[PDB]
Structures are given as C-alpha cells and as structure tokens.
Amino acid sequence: CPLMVKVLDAVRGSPAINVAVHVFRKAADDTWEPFASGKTSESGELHGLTTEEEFVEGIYKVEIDTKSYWKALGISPFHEHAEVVFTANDSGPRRYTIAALLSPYSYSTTAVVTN
Amino acid sequence: CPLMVKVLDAVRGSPAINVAVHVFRKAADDTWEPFASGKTSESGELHGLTTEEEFVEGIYKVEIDTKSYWKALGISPFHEHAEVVFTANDSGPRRYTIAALLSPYSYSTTAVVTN
Amino acid sequence: CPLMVKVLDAVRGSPAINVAVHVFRKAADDTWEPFASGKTSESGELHGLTTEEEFVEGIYKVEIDTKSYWKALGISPFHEHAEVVFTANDSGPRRYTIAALLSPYSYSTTAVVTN
Amino acid sequence: CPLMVKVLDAVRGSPAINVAVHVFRKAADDTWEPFASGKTSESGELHGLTTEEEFVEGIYKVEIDTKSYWKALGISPFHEHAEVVFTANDSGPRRYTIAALLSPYSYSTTAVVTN
Numbered sequence A, B, C, D: 001c002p003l004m005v006k007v008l009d010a011v012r013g014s015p016a017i018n019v020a021v022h023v024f025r026k027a028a029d030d031t032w033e034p035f036a037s038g039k040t041s042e043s044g045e046l047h048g049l050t051t052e053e054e055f056v057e058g059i060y061k062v063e064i065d066t067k068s069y070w071k072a073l074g075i076s077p078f079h080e081h082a083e084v085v086f087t088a089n090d091s092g093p094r095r096y097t098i099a100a101l102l103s104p105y106s107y108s109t110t111a112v113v114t115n
C-alpha cells in the first residue's frame, strides 16, 4: 500500500479507532475530487485506500474526522477535522504514511515517506 | 483581537517570520469565502485579522502557507500548507489564539481560547 | 529575562496554570543542582527565573510537574513530569523560551531562542 | 515485548535510524539504575529492551540521544536528549510503546499503552 493513515489518541494513550478518513485529489478544474475513504481499525491504522496504479502524481488532501471521534467520547473539541494537504509522487512513486496524534484542542501530524 | 495566529519554526528555534496566512469563512453553499489574511511579524504573530463585530459564530479555516516558507529556507517540505478548521462559538471562548509549530515534514497546531 | 517557560493545556485549550517548574544546572560531579523554580501564572508563563548574570553557559534541566497538574483535573496521566535538557550558549541566542504543550499521554516541547 | 521505542525524523520525514536509547529504573535508594539500552533500527524502532519478567513495576526513564543523532547530520540541536519518565506496570503488566518525533529545536513524545 502506497498510502496509509495512522491516528493516535493523546488523552487515552491508545490508537484512535473507528476514525473516518476521506481523501481527495485536486482535479484539472482546480476542485477537490473524492479519491478514497475508510475508517481506522483497532490498531488506529487505515490501509487499502489505494493502489500504486491509481495513486498517480497529484495534490492530495487527507481529511481526518476528529470532531466525530471526540464527540462520541463526550468531548467537545476545537477542530472540525485535521487536514493534511501534500503533493505526492512528483519524483516517482513513494510510500506515504500520514500520522495524526489527537488531543481535544490540538493535533500533531507527520509523514514518513519511503522509496 | 478576537483572533490571533502564531507560527513557530522547529528547525531554527525561532518565530516563523513573513509567513502568509489566509482565513476563510464557510458560506451557505459550503464554499470557503475569503475572510482575512496577512503575513506573520518578526515575532511570528499576526494580529488585527478581524474585529469582535465581524467575527461571528461560524466555521472558519486558517491556511498557513508553510510550503513557501520552507522553500525560501531551502528545505524540501511535505505539506502544501497547514490548515486549521474550527467552529467559533460565543458560549465563553472570547479570544482565540491559533498556534502552529512547523517542521518540514510535520506540524503541531493548538488553540488557546481564553475569557 | 534570559529564560522564560510557558506551559499550555491541549485538553482544555488553555494556559496550564499553577504548574510547578524546577530548573537545575549540571554540576562538576554530574549531579543536578537546584537552580530556579516557580509556578506558572494565569497566562501559563513563568518569568523571572534567573538573571543574565546568573545564567551562564552550562547544561540546564527544566522539569515541568505535569503529573500533579493532570491529577488535579482528574485525568490519568502517563508521565511523571516533562523534562527539557539543553546547553545554554552565549554565541547568539540571548533569550530562551521553553514551551510545553501538554496532553495526558503526550507532550510537545519547543525552544524559541531570539536575539 | 512489553517495551518498544520508536523514533521519527520530522525534517526528513523518515524513521530516525541508529539513535541511541538508554533506559533506567528508579531504585530503592532513589537513584537511576541502568535497566536496558539499544539503538533504533532502519525502521526507527527498538525492540527487545526487556522481558515481561524483568519489566516489573517501577518508575522508568527512557533517554533518547537526540543530540548525537542531529550532530551526525550536521545540525546543532537545542536539546541534549529527549527524556520520557513514567510509572510502569502499577496496575499489572502492560505493553508500552514510547514514540518521539524529532526536530532540531523541538520534539513531541507520546505513549501507546495496551493490555
């Protein structure tokens, strides 16, 4: 899998399970087109969003539905979601892991990119 | 000052100076309409974005132009920009400070909301 | 003010008030000798820890008493405290701000060093 | 393995390889006794530090040698190391993953604790 998303809970010290993730790709018309979506597993990970063939060069947006996550735990969080916007595969195919560590009023996101 | 944005550089250990920041407000048709913008000061801060009268309840997006910042320093960045999307609510939180701590492949963002 | 410490709460989206902070300086025998301490203010800041005359080059440790902070709020924390260990150097960096953003199972710390 | 350490590089967007890690356990005499040590692999991970039998209840300190890491890459970083101090196994055996995301003037650490 060339694209994996991992979400972690900084309040509980655990994976963030059942978190909705939507991925979009910027089209020629400059608009965000739907690309893939899924939900994190018991390990806080989301694999299988795409394939090397489908995951061509482009500008991608990964929207992590953090508000729904926090609300379901009784917390009214600051953010609507966490968004990660990046150019992918502009130097050939790479493998991307996008990670987000979540708190009610904060998040930290990083990427690990391998060849 | 109901809204302040502060940007820090984790590579240099300094404020992130001359960073472009664009604020948008969610419209009825769900499109993002320009609301306010500026460039961070020598202290990494951007004040005077809006007034209490103009800063009504609503969904806001703050886009921090991190890619251009890193390009000027000669370090390959991952993100197109850093985005913070939140609902402004009158129920207490009067002053909003959105902070972002920047690295080439990561950012951490928080909100400090005080009465 | 050559040294300032700032502590923020990622769960409440607020300064972390009344947090105990202890600063130590590395001695010849490699032991940590008490140097300065205090409690964060209503703004989450602790100023007046030391003076330019006293703040000589050396290795310093800043211990932020996060466990007690979280216990008072009724949230099970992971860490005993947050520690920041650094060498103070006269070669430019005149003012040191050590910041820590706190969650029950995580913290992010940065330094902003300005002339 | 009940204790695993993962270290990530926020400048390169990669695992942080060959990072020295020392673990200590607080003794009866209130001093830090050596407990385990190792270095992160090509995946930025360090497994095999301890066993369920040896990893008894106690206060542990995980010292991640970040300064040596940054120096070897030509960077003069702010911190001497990153230290993670926590009580372990005080409610029975748990599995701990301690993660640190590194920048020259900043780091973020989190823990994932499973049963």
Ligand SMILES: O=C(O)CCNC(=O)c1cc(-c2ccc(F)cc2F)cc(I)c1O
Binding pocket: B006, B008, B097, B098, B099, B100, B101, B108, B109, B110, B111, B112, C006, C008, C014, C015, C043, C044, C097, C099, C100, C101, C108, C109, C110, C112
């Ligand atoms: O003054 C306030 O309490 C709000 C304005 N500043 C910040 O929220 C802030 C955040 C950070 C910060 C942001 C992200 C992070 F991961 C760690 C941090 F310490 C650092 C500094 I210096 C700050 O003044």
Ligand SMILES: O=C(O)CCNC(=O)c1cc(-c2ccc(F)cc2F)cc(I)c1O
Binding pocket: A006, A008, A097, A098, A099, A100, A101, A108, A109, A110, A111, A112, D006, D008, D015, D043, D044, D097, D099, D100, D101, D108, D109, D110, D112
């Ligand atoms: O395992 C990899 O090499 C890439 C996928 N995972 C992460 O990037 C990752 C990030 C974090 C992490 C994310 C944000 C942060 F501020 C600190 C962190 F330690 C924690 C863990 I456990 C992780 O496995």
